[PDB]
């Protein structure tokens, strides 16, 4: 029994060896497959922030293959501790590169995607990447809650993208076109509307005029009503996709996605931590924002009666481990 | 590395040498690292596979001999240059002019007419006289293959055959003549893979006799060539002289 | 030569079958390293561990003991309508067995008192109809000020050591297990400035041990 | 007798697949000893080391310092046009990745003295403008008297770990990598006696680790 | 991802097909050829008469973005618009010509 | 395992194994395949100049093989040095049979293919080559160069073949038809005009009445323009082919041959070495011309003003370890 | 059950293949012993050596 | 060195030399003078406690300045500058802040360039311009390149001072 | 003869072995077949009167198999 019985514990080819002499014989044939190529060296940087920046390979060798015709010869969330309601102390902090953000009561705080393994970068340079500025806690638009949004109504301050502009969008990025319009916005794809409203920052200064960037990101909302307000609110943090195939006026199953609910009854805070996901080592600038940061409320906030309606909320965005690759003239967006 | 250098090594060169160099330079801040090469490059995996001849010394893809009538497709590399389209078989060869392979000829052909009917082909090997008017028992002392086509259309089959040139490489252009008294200018006939005649057949023998069509692919084997030389030419895309500069050069600024 | 007479299938193209197509590529090629991207997912039960939400409950302030807030019956059928995961899961296949935790949140001022009763009632002919009869099976009687969630699970109590997926004939034997309950048993009271009402949100994700197998098209639209 | 059932290819011919064809002859014979015929090829990138002749470029006399000689755009689009070797090689494939070296010559007296600046600008929406703008990304100030020559590297600096051969749609990602150019920046100097301008031509041969795969028919016809 | 496709031809005539795939990316001819669309790679199916001809293929992975996104959010050209999707993610493109005696 | 998986790394058969006793077996065929010969002995000649004569196999055995049913039994361009301009002194030299040419400045000098290993003769005799004469330097047509020839022009003699002689050359060989017309010539044949203005010397003696020839060829061109003077020239010498399917006004991918650019700025002299590439180890007489000279134009020479237009050159042709085999009446050509 | 598809071939008759045809008999049976029959000829070239009348 | 153990040749002769920096590179023929100024001093402790940002190019390579045009009626020590120069009087009483354009623009200007000051102008998106905006205090060390290619014939001289702060 | 003679004494497929790595292969194709599940525990309980009630199954482990995607390591 050599080279037969593949991909076990079914009735079907799975591919599970990716070659063997065998297949492709001329005797018989079984369908192709693929294997890891390893393109030997490169600053090794994938996901932050476990990227070393050593190439393993050697370098300036330049040694190629095949010979040349024309040369003669060369060579937790357990129930074994409960977190206790906002009443208790319980104090947590989260800090940054200078700016550091304390809370009383209970924060819930996650890491979305456990960081994956480096693979060596297609390019060959080195990656140019500063400390803060372009780290610690940048405060985007501060939202007002209301009490007249029923479950899921997108709340977002006044940087966010509007509905249809996560639909045709145009060129080049911001028109202030689709920015300005009756009611909005919903949400604030992470990319795109981090560089608004933050020209002066150096990451800001950077992702202009060098081409292909590398951050992960990680998001911050503190909300604190009273003691006696009730509420809760959901913070997303999808994973690039037009809002349509993401969600449309249900988001009964988006929890599948990160989520980290704030529930206003114990909670006055809440964090994500997110590697990125992009098909290729280094997005493009200018054009495909990976995340997009949705905020939604589960359940309408109803007030103490005979105090005011609405409520206040800011929103707390920063990069991690952030990369750039290559330079050019200085770009808009 | 080390970033900024004073002493760094120049990018100058020679390229009046025939030999031409392209090693990377060290640049400071740049990791230069080798790949591996995958193997769609080499010719013997790049040959392998079957492509399309143009049929005759012109008007491919396909040949139309009329029945009861033999064709003798002759397998010449110097014959398919000849009226040779840019893109194909036919100019991918032109690159080099020495070639030994055995030569897998898999062809196929549609009667129209609607009675089965089956094809008798020959291999003669190089050089072999070619009867005028084959005829069954003649044309079958050589090799012998019978090929049932489908009554609606659309039979095929493969061959393998073995190299026979005593040229021990075939040209596939040659300068100077063949006869000794004689022109034939050009080109050579004793260098290639013999001749395929082959002769139809058809048991009803109804009238309206008609006119067999066919085409074939060939695919090179164990491949050896020699010496190069350049591509042929590709048309260039227009000019959109709209936005230039996005693509195509400009020059003469 | 070998020889061979041809079975009667004689081309019947299967779905699961070995090989069966030959390759219409070579020069086989290395894919592009990509340990980089995370959270790979190997399995359809990963998602039946992600939770998702059933329905709201509202909770009064005004309100008699006995009042039941909301009693979903335990099925592929009932559970296929809410749209959450395991909604979908269970849906996708046709056989299911496990047991399946209800999450339940609390979404409410830091002074609210209550206790909600989560009744379990094993199959039978007619549903529940009060606590006193609905409240058997199994209970726990939740305070709504100890942790803001309660973790409920839905035991496995049944005959087959599977269950079907069935919809056209949801009243039917091993299509079911019994049906849950959100009863009240003591209203709610707080200080008359705090909010009149509090909603009352059930998660259901599938716990441990939950198993699925046999594929068939989602059963929602047929 | 074994017993087989036809899997529903039934005659199918591929392109890549193994024997499939009946040997029409036999007597298998040697092959004339051929081993005095020299520089036997054995790879498609053995071509792709050996220059070829992009474009001549003028250079004058009277001339001003920020003026563009040329500016053409690395692609498989811009390459494919210019008719060289790697001109034909990276059209008959269909994804290529590496770095392309650039030659320039200069055919001149051998009193002249002048910079040409060769910048790199990887991608961006539109082109460069002036020297200030697109001399960024890389350049090597070069002077026109110290080799008659100069070996260039267009490094490989993109996204993805290959890119794609298009041509109906150039202007495309992964089609293309940035743009060269070459700028003057201080123009020729010599005697009265001195010939008036002085061609430059620029070569262009792929470097080391510069790869290809996955057959398709010349992309410049189609 | 592997690839089975049955098509039927209801004239009565027996029928070839040439089915062919241009790996990603790589030019599609406006107006398809015998010859030129060949070169890529070739399948011959012969198809019944009465109908019902199938046949089946199996395309290695071939993508150099590593991983295809099923949904993308952002532009493809530099310049152009193309929004929301891009043309060299994913597993070539099979042209097929029909062929009638 | 065994006789499979054949030409490993692809789905098809690369004809890995010439033969095998698997192969067309009665229960499975594979395509065929070829093994080479080795035609015992012979004076191992085939490519200049690493011929030994020698025969390794054993001489006047004669001993055949089947037994007669009549008999009861028997038995470089590296950057790391660059070479300066004319300016700078530099000296070399390239000797020959007795003549020799001196040089000062840069001169490109290459050895166009690696000289191949001989492979044994299919006739048996001894071959008889000259030294010198038949080696040195034979000096062609010296050819003027004009400013008015744009790119690609094919600059040649008195000597050389005309563009339409390239095709319909006629019998026999020379007829002094397709020699002499308006506008001539594009280039020379290597084998064919170098007998013509040379009949006396011995390889021309030769090469009438010897049939089969063996020759390898190395050409050299000579252009001193003042330091003040500008432009460039290639030395192509193409294999054998029709100009037509060779270059058609074009030249542009026509550095796939050997090349070495002459570039009068930083050189006054090139040579090329090349071993004769032709198939069958000898190539008849008075037919067949393996190599093809063409002498081109990169860049128009621009001369400093006041001074004449003109310049010329010179093109010295020579043979490398000639050889001939058999004898006949003599054969103009 | 092994499974097959048909290579394009489907019933060519070469001239060149190893067997292809069924046996018409059975019962093998051995050929009278002929070791006396003088001056056996296994090959074609045994003829070559065999001198031939060109002209007078 | 300069000694005259090995003397440099004149412009006539090869002799290669290239000057590399974070990507740019600068390749020249002939002699090229090149110094470093004053041996590099020891590290001192800082004073305040904080990690500092570095970029590597962006704000490395080499950054062009406004090329000059000379002329031939400058006489002996005319201090030639191009466009992005303070002119003389800007030297004195520069006024705040920085750059009004007031003292940058006068008939006949600029006698020079202070160097962090003129490079941050005509350079506002590189980094190291986004960077010295919002980081208050900030260190490097700066190397100076000028580069003049008269025919054989031509016959001048010039100087680069590079002079440390003062009026 | 291995994995061959299948269901001896009869001329047809018993299912004399539920798997075998070598039915269902590319090659060749058996029909399939079952194998027992081994529900772990479970209060022993079938026919009176053997039943035990004491469960062989470890109790509250409740080990779960695959690895959630959003956990670093667990075992």
Not at chain 1, 172 to 193: E, G, H, I, K, R
Not at chain 1, 227 to 245: K, N, R, W
Not at chain 3, 117 to 140: I, L
Request: one cysteine or more; a negative charge.
């Amino acid at each position: 029994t050599n080279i037969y019985g593949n991909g076990n514990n079914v009735n079907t080819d799975v591919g599970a060896n990716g070659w063997a002499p065998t297949v492709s014989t001329g005797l018989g044939d079984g369908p192709v497959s693929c294997t890891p190529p390893t393109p030997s060296p490169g600053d090794t940087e994938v996901p932050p922030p476990r990227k070393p920046f050593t190439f393993p390979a050697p370098p300036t060798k330049s040694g190629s293959r095949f010979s040349k015709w024309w040369e003669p010869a060369a060579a937790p969330s357990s129930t074994a501790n409960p977190q206790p309601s906002l009443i208790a102390l319980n104090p947590s902090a989260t800090q940054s590169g200078n700016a550091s953000i304390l809370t009383g009561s209970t924060a819930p705080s996650l890491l979305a995607y456990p960081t994956a393994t480096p693979v060596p970068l297609p390019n060959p340079d080195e990656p140019s990447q500063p400390g803060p500025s372009g780290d610690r806690t940048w405060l985007l638009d501060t939202v007002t809650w209301s009490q007249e949004f029923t479950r899921g109504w997108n709340i977002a301050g006044s940087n966010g993208m509007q509905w249809t502009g996560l639909e045709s969008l145009i060129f080049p990025v911001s028109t202030d076109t689709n920015w300005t319009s009756t009611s909005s916005p919903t949400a604030y794809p992470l990319p795109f509307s981090f560089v608004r409203a933050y020209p002066d920052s150096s990451w800001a200064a950077m992702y202009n005029t060098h081409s292909m960037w590398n951050c992960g990101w990680r998001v911050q909302v503190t909300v604190n009503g009273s003691q006696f307000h009730a509420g809760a609110l959901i913070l997303y943090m999808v994973p690039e996709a037009t809002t349509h195939a993401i969600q449309t006026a249900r988001d009964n199953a988006g929890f599948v996605f990160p989520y980290v609910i704030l529930n206003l009854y114990e909670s006055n805070t809440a964090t994500i931590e997110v590697p990125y996901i992009s098909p290729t080592p280094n997005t493009s600038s200018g054009l495909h924002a990976p995340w997009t940061f949705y905020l939604q409320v589960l359940s309408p906030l109803n007030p103490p009666p005979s105090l005011p309606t609405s409520l206040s909320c800011s929103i707390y965005v920063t990069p991690v481990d952030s990369s750039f690759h290559g330079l050019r003239y200085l770009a808009p967006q | 590395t080390l970033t900024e250098d004073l002493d760094a090594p120049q990018d100058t060169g020679n390229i009046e040498n025939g030999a031409a160099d392209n090693s990377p330079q060290p640049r400071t801040t740049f990791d230069y690292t080798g790949n591996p090469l995958p193997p769609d490059t080499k010719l013997e995996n790049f040959f392998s596979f079957y492509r399309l001849l143009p049929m005759g010394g012109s008007g491919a893809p396909s040949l139309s001999f009329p029945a009861d009538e033999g064709t003798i497709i002759p397998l010449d590399p110097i014959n398919w240059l000849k009226g040779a389209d840019v893109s194909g078989i036919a100019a991918m060869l032109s690159c080099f002019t020495y070639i030994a392979a055995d030569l897998r000829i898999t062809l196929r052909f549609s009667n129209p007419n609607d009675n089965p009917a089956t094809m008798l082909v020959a291999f003669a090997p190089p050089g072999a006289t070619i009867p005028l008017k084959p005829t069954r028992q003649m044309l079958s002392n050589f090799y012998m293959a019978e090929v049932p086509v489908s009554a609606a259309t659309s039979t095929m089959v493969s061959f393998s055959i073995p190299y026979t040139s005593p040229l021990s490489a075939i040209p596939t252009s040659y300068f100077g003549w063949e006869d000794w008294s004689g022109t034939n200018f050009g080109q050579l006939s004793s260098g290639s893979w013999g001749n395929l005649m082959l002769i139809p057949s058809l048991s009803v023998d109804s009238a309206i006799p008609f006119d067999f069509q066919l085409s074939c692919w060939v695919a090179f084997g164990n491949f050896k060539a020699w010496v190069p030389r350049p591509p042929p030419p590709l048309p260039p895309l227009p000019t959109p002289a709209a936005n230039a500069e996005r693509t195509v050069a400009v020059i003469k600024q | 030569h070998w020889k061979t007479r041809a079975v009667p299938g004689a081309g019947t193209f299967g779905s699961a079958v070995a090989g069966q197509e030959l390759p219409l590529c070579g020069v086989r090629a290395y894919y592009p390293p990509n340990a980089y991207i995370p959270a790979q997912v190997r399995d359809w039960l990963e998602f039946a561990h992600r939770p998702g939400l059933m329905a709201t409950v509202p909770w009064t302030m005004a309100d008699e003991p006995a009042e039941r807030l909301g009693i979903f019956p335990v099925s592929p059928s009932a559970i296929a309508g809410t749209g959450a995961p395991i909604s979908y899961v269970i849906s996708l296949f046709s056989q299911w067995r496990g047991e399946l935790a209800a999450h339940l949140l609390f979404t409410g001022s830091a002074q609210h008192y209550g206790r909600l009763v989560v009744c379990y009632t094993p199959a039978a002919p007619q549903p529940p109809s009060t606590m006193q009869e609905a409240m058997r099976g199994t209970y726990t009687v939740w305070d709504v000020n100890a942790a803001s969630t309660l973790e409920f699970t839905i035991p496995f109590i049944s005959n087959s050591y599977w269950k079907t997926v069935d919809v056209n004939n949801p009243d039917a034997l091993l299509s079911t297990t019994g049906y849950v309950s959100i009863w009240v048993q003591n209203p709610l009271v707080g200080p008359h400035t705090a909010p009149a009402s509090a909603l009352v949100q059930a998660f259901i994700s599938a716990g441990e041990s939950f198993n699925v197998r046999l594929m068939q098209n989602p059963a929602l639209t047929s």
